[PDB]
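Example 3.
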Amino acid sequence: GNFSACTHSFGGTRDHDVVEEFIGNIETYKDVEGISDENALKGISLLFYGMASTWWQGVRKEATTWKEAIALIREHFSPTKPAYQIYMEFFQNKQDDHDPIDTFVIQKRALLAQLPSGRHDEETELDLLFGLLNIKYRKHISRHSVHTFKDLLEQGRIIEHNN
Amino acid sequence: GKGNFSACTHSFGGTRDHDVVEEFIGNIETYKDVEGISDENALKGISLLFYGMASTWWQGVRKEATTWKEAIALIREHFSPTKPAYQIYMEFFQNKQDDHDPIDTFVIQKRALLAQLPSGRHDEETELDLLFGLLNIKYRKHISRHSVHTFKDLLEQGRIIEHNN
Ligand SMILES: [Cl-]
Ligand SMILES: [Cl-]
Ligand SMILES: [Cl-]
Ligand code: NA
Ligand code: NA
């Protein structure tokens, strides 16, 4: 009753649906066979082979609960762009002299939409963006004069129309 | 009785001092409450409370302040001397860790900026995400993002690399 009879296995395939299917299968097996969280944690290494086994050897001390073991599998194997990479790319290029504010804001908010969904509110997102705006706009627009991207775009478009 | 600030003894000239701003806001909130002035009327009468730079400032922003609450938030935002968050982020991302900057002084310079943002805005995981891309390849070869959870972990692992090299 520790997964020694379980026919599900995971080798480290970096495929979201494969990871969710595996996690779903072992949660079901655990529930149907009446395995405790503590025993599921002590037996989970029986379900890994290849790269997943080498991986588990490296992280198992971090998994103090069954729930943390499941979170480690999702975090490590479900593929995503690392947040640190998104921030670096966000700060890599300032707004050009001839790039209008709408397309500049679209591209930047597109990078912000790659970060975890609940992490930043619109105020924080505006703070991240505001320093990259062209000096042409910041001469007219105080950070304290805008609360939303829509406020910023409304003032920026007026500036563009008056050139 | 009063419907305006004509009997208020408090005024603000634009001193960029957090304690002065909070004292002024507290004093006009007390007067407003004692005289039973509504939010809407306090906003219509607020210009009497400003002189000098604060008067010129208010002339320039008053259209943005559609409520008393928004007026008070604009005073706090404009007169509390702080580096604005957007400038903190730009300065943070301006310099990568050089080949000769060790982990202690790199982390200290970056924490000096992060400590100027609102205390509850970013948890340590988010602060490490902001930092990690700026770390020199000397550290990133040996230190995986998934392997550090705290600045203490990062400092401990970076010092081992330095002790070896
Ligand atoms: Cl079993
Ligand atoms: Cl006062
Ligand atoms: Cl501060
Ligand atoms: Na302005
Ligand atoms: Na407003």
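The CA atoms of residues 62 and 79 of chain A lie 20 Å apart. Chain A touches chain B at residues 75-76, 82-85, 87-88, 91, 119, 124, 126-132, 143-145 (CB under 8 Å).
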